[PDB]
Amino acid sequence: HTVRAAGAVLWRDATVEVAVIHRPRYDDWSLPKGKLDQGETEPVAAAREIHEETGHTAVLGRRLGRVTYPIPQGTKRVWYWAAKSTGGDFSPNDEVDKLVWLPVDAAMDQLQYPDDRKVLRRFVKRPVDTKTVLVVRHGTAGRRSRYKGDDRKRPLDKRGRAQAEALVAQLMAFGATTLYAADRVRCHQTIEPLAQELDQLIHNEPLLTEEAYAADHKAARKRLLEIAGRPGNPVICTQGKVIPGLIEWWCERAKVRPETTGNRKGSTWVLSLSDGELVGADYLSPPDEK
Numbered sequence: 001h002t003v004r005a006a007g008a009v010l011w012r013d014a015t016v017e018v019a020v021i022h023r024p025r026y027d028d029w030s031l032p033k034g035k036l037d038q039g040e041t042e043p044v045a046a047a048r049e050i051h052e053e054t055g056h057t058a059v060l061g062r063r064l065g066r067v068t069y070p071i072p073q074g075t076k077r078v079w080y081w082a083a084k085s086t087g088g089d090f091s092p093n094d095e096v097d098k099l100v101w102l103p104v105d106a107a108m109d110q111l112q113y114p115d116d117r118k119v120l121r122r123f124v125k126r127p128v129d130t131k132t133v134l135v136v137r138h139g140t141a142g143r144r145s146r147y148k149g150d151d152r153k154r155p156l157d158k159r160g161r162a163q164a165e166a167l168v169a170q171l172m173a174f175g176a177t178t179l180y181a182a183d184r185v186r187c188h189q190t191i192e193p194l195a196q197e198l199d200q201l202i203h204n205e206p207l208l209t210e211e212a213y214a215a216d217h218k219a220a221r222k223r224l225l226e227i228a229g230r231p232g233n234p235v236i237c238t239q240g241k242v243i244p245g246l247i248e249w250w251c252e253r254a255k256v257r258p259e260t261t262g263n264r265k266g267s268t269w270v271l272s273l274s275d276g277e278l279v280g281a282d283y284l285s286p287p288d289e290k
């Protein structure tokens, strides 16, 4: 059987230091990580494990690939994120008795596991003090054909509504702060629960609908870079025939290679930017899909 896990390179600005944790049961030094709970997404699990093992709050940024290791019951697969500390503090807990803060070169020597060192090498290979644009395909909204009315008004269905609620923890894990939706009800409804969590308004985006993108993709590209250039971490909720075009165009331009890809309803692209440059493009499946 395969156990799904998530973890992080937790870092702080002391000037970058990374957190290495000591687990006395095994007596080893490692990166924070643990198993996904039922219905949990990998990012939410990574943030939860950071808090349980380190005592810190953090904001996730770039994804740092995946580690696979054999366990008695089979295989454990761990997706890792860069995570900037935003608060809290370390007190000994059930898993961890010691935490050190080390510069990367010293952390490399401290780590027990070769695959943790590989994660740390990926961490240092690109900027970590990044801002984040979260491009979300709206949740499930039934069929165009079976809808009676202006399709622009077609609402999320029950599943899509549940996806919208499950995206709050997802997007909050990346420190979402500002909200944008294409001019379709199903796009606005997808981030309505996050708007309620942040107490922030959603900015309507007529250029980012399927019809507008089809007729003027250059206006859509320009609007995306404008939103991305503003302070904060924006969520942009749009449609299936817009997202691949925008993501592939930015990735090709920046020479960024996505490790995963897809376009499902309720999916998220985490676009990591440093000084205006795309440095990561991480596709996250919908919160209710593997």
Ligand SMILES: Nc1nc2c(ncn2[C@@H]2O[C@H](COP(=O)(O)OP(=O)(O)O)[C@@H](O)[C@H]2O)c(=O)[nH]1
Binding pocket: 026, 030, 069, 070, 071, 076, 113, 116
């Ligand atoms: N190869 C490798 N083994 C690990 C790692 N982390 C834990 N283990 C080992 O895998 C087994 C299960 O530990 P772990 O996955 O941490 O689960 P838990 O301790 O049951 O929560 C133990 O034998 C650990 O020593 C790792 O990062 N790489």
Ligand SMILES: [Mg+2]
Binding pocket: none
């Ligand atoms: Mg383990």
